[PDB]
Enzyme design. Structure first.
Site, PDB file in Angstrom:
ATOM      1  CG  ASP A   1       9.918  -4.987   1.398  1.00  0.00           C
ATOM      2  OD1 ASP A   1      10.407  -6.130   1.215  1.00  0.00           O
ATOM      3  OD2 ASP A   1       9.967  -4.404   2.509  1.00  0.00           O
TER       4      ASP A   1
ATOM      5  CD  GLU B   1       6.683  -3.110   6.384  1.00  0.00           C
ATOM      6  OE1 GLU B   1       7.597  -2.652   5.655  1.00  0.00           O
ATOM      7  OE2 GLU B   1       5.465  -2.990   6.117  1.00  0.00           O
TER       8      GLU B   1
HETATM    9  N1  LIG Z   1      12.446   7.124  -1.494  1.00  0.00           N
HETATM   10  C1  LIG Z   1      11.316   6.464  -1.783  1.00  0.00           C
HETATM   11  N2  LIG Z   1      10.811   6.551  -3.065  1.00  0.00           N
HETATM   12  C2  LIG Z   1       9.670   5.883  -3.369  1.00  0.00           C
HETATM   13  N3  LIG Z   1       8.924   5.107  -2.555  1.00  0.00           N
HETATM   14  C3  LIG Z   1       9.451   5.042  -1.294  1.00  0.00           C
HETATM   15  C4  LIG Z   1      10.613   5.675  -0.833  1.00  0.00           C
HETATM   16  N4  LIG Z   1      10.843   5.388   0.506  1.00  0.00           N
HETATM   17  C5  LIG Z   1       9.839   4.610   0.833  1.00  0.00           C
HETATM   18  N5  LIG Z   1       8.951   4.349  -0.210  1.00  0.00           N
HETATM   19  C6  LIG Z   1       7.730   3.518  -0.179  1.00  0.00           C
HETATM   20  O1  LIG Z   1       7.571   3.041   1.157  1.00  0.00           O
HETATM   21  C7  LIG Z   1       7.616   1.597   1.207  1.00  0.00           C
HETATM   22  C8  LIG Z   1       8.207   1.119   2.509  1.00  0.00           C
HETATM   23  O2  LIG Z   1       9.615   1.369   2.546  1.00  0.00           O
HETATM   24  P1  LIG Z   1      10.595   0.248   3.122  1.00  0.00           P
HETATM   25  O3  LIG Z   1      10.081  -0.146   4.459  1.00  0.00           O
HETATM   26  O4  LIG Z   1      11.960   0.766   3.394  1.00  0.00           O
HETATM   27  C9  LIG Z   1      10.626  -1.206   2.062  1.00  0.00           C
HETATM   28  P2  LIG Z   1      11.622  -1.041   0.593  1.00  0.00           P
HETATM   29  O5  LIG Z   1      12.221   0.310   0.522  1.00  0.00           O
HETATM   30  O6  LIG Z   1      10.699  -1.001  -0.558  1.00  0.00           O
HETATM   31  O7  LIG Z   1      12.606  -2.259   0.502  1.00  0.00           O
HETATM   32  P3  LIG Z   1      13.627  -2.399   1.648  1.00  0.00           P
HETATM   33  O8  LIG Z   1      13.197  -3.219   2.809  1.00  0.00           O
HETATM   34  O9  LIG Z   1      14.738  -3.023   0.889  1.00  0.00           O
HETATM   35  O10 LIG Z   1      14.035  -1.158   2.363  1.00  0.00           O
HETATM   36  C10 LIG Z   1       8.417   1.227  -0.024  1.00  0.00           C
HETATM   37  O11 LIG Z   1       8.242  -0.138  -0.360  1.00  0.00           O
HETATM   38  C11 LIG Z   1       7.892   2.234  -1.041  1.00  0.00           C
HETATM   39  O12 LIG Z   1       6.690   1.793  -1.664  1.00  0.00           O
END
Ligand SMILES: Nc1ncnc2c1ncn2[C@@H]1O[C@H](COP(=O)(O)CP(=O)(O)OP(=O)(O)O)[C@@H](O)[C@H]1O
Ligand SMILES: Nc1ncnc2c1ncn2[C@@H]1O[C@H](COP(=O)(O)CP(=O)(O)OP(=O)(O)O)[C@@H](O)[C@H]1O
Ligand SMILES: [Mg+2]
Ligand SMILES: [Mg+2]
Lengths: 280, 280
Positions: free
Chosen positions: A51, A163
């Site tokens: 994402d 989501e």
């Molecule tokens: N370790 C991290 N470093 C930077 N941004 C982070 C992070 N963990 C979460 N985020 C922020 O929080 C958002 C939501 O996280 P997720 O729900 O897990 C979607 P993603 O991580 O981007 O892709 P994913 O579905 O492949 O997990 C991310 O898209 C990002 O913008």
């Protein structure tokens, strides 16, 4: 209008899409909104996950177009690990694909830990792994808004249909943002845009994970949901799925409506119509 | 309609109210919402200021009623000073009026300072007093949601019409909450409810302030807004105000629309209709 159909409509799902066209509309959206606000660009946490990888590339494309049109804009990609991130390599790979104007690393551990320690000391109890996880997500929001506040940038959110339908995000955590370029997209459609944009396949084949838990780092979204993204996308794209699956998707949708609305007041109807709602 | 009539309607303002009836409807609302969620009660930060003093008392009345009805509920009042609060005395007076089931004190300074030191360290720049102030408001939200998540409690918000019309709150800070019992009330009306509840006059004659700045602690809202609550309430209650005052109010309302909506997506019309938005 079946519940599945109301959900598809409410979440702006397009059963069939043209990846090039979607990218055009979503990049245009980022440009149109920012022009309205007079902001200087965008800021977004890049996790190495699908994402943020997609939302990040869209943001970089937007600011480059804004500059080409004679404007002033910058995109800052921000790494927000909690201590050493398990999949830092995938995050670096995402950064290589995004090619952001600026990137910076901000370890949120000292802040999150200062909070948890204080909580333990004053509340006489330790935060469950889950609740500390939400603290992490909220501190990530805080960090992005601080950078946005300091540089005059808008905070991009990565919410999408896959989501949104399950309310799979932290309220005022990653759910807190100024604008959403991925709204309406299913998980597979997201991978389709990434392919159109020429992303390394490791960036869209990687297993989805919020990675917030200390005792189960990298836990698969599907392990938590008890539902696969294949099923969710099928459901959202209007396909037929087992009554079993449909019921589980629809109950999670209805109980998490509060996460898709602004705070409830006595003048709002959505919560009155709801047979039930669950926050914890 | 005039923009004034539109605003009055959009914010659910009642030009004339019966304090007794308002308390009943608002206490009923808290009971109705929590009941539909199976939550164990509420949590709210008590600042010593008018809004949380009133919302706090309504929450306590709500849980006492739930219990009298054979249910199970509790209300936790939480003190959230940054280091040492200048008007801690007023907060103590507020707590004595609220008479919450439970109350705790949580200094947010170690968390806020941990963040600020990391920010300055990594972005080679110090947070402006205003942006650090927003970090404080956001950490207050984090704290209430942590306690809420740990004890199964819903987070109460103190937004009302006099604050909503100017967008006078931190996005995802004090703006982040689950339910709002004060929606639609003008500042003046809030005082009316406090008087009906028999509050010590010091609790509603106290100067309104977000008190988030290190350099200008306890700064009056009116000083920051350049508009008095006397003028906002007149405008909101449908009375005539000088043309220049109405213009300032209406401009602030239109540019702060994004704070009264969930994150924007290309499918929302409110931002497209807006001639301009202001985030900074
Ligand atoms: N370790 C991290 N470093 C930077 N941004 C982070 C992070 N963990 C979460 N985020 C922020 O929080 C958002 C939501 O996280 P997720 O729900 O897990 C979607 P993603 O991580 O981007 O892709 P994913 O579905 O492949 O997990 C991310 O898209 C990002 O913008
Ligand atoms: N020092 C503090 N301790 C506890 N909660 C606080 C706080 N400062 C702010 N808050 C929380 O943030 C909310 C919003 O703050 P304010 O806008 O200033 C309204 P208020 O402080 O309650 O009355 P006021 O208008 O008289 O200032 C408060 O109602 C409270 O729930
Ligand atoms: Mg992820
Ligand atoms: Mg105050």
């Amino acid at each position: 209008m079946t519940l599945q159909e109301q959900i598809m409509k409410a979440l702006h799902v397009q059963p069939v899409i043209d990846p090039k066209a979607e990218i055009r509309k979503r990049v245009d959206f980022l440009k149109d909104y920012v022009k309205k606000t007079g902001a200087k660009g965008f800021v977004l946490g890049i996790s190495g996950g699908q994402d943020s990888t997609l939302a990040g590339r869209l943001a970089q494309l937007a600011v480059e177009e804004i500059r080409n049109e004679g404007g002033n804009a910058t995109f800052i990609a921000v790494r927000l690990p909690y201590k050493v991130q398990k999949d830092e390599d995938d995050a670096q790979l995402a950064l290589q694909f995004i090619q952001a104007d600026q990137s910076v690393a901000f370890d949120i551990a000292s802040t999150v830990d200062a909070f948890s320690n204080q909580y333990e000391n004053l509340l006489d109890e330790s935060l469950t792994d889950f609740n500390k996880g939400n603290v992490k997500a909220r501190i990530r929001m805080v960090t992005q808004y601080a950078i946005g506040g300091q540089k005059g940038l808008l905070v991009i959110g990565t919410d999408h249909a896959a989501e949104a339908v399950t309310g799979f995000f932290t309220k005022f955590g990653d759910g807190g943002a100024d604008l959403l370029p991925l709204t309406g997209l299913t998980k597979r459609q997201g991978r389709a845009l990434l392919q159109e944009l020429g992303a390394d396949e490791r960036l869209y084949l990687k297993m989805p994970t919020a990675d917030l838990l200390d005792e189960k780092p990298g836990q698969a979204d599907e392990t938590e949901l008890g539902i696969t993204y294949d099923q969710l996308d099928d459901y959202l794209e209007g396909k037929t799925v087992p009554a079993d699956v449909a019921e589980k998707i629809e109950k999670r949708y209805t109980v998490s409506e509060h996460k898709r609305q602004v705070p409830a007041s006595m003048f709002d109807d959505w919560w009155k119509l709801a047979a039930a709602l669950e926050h914890h």
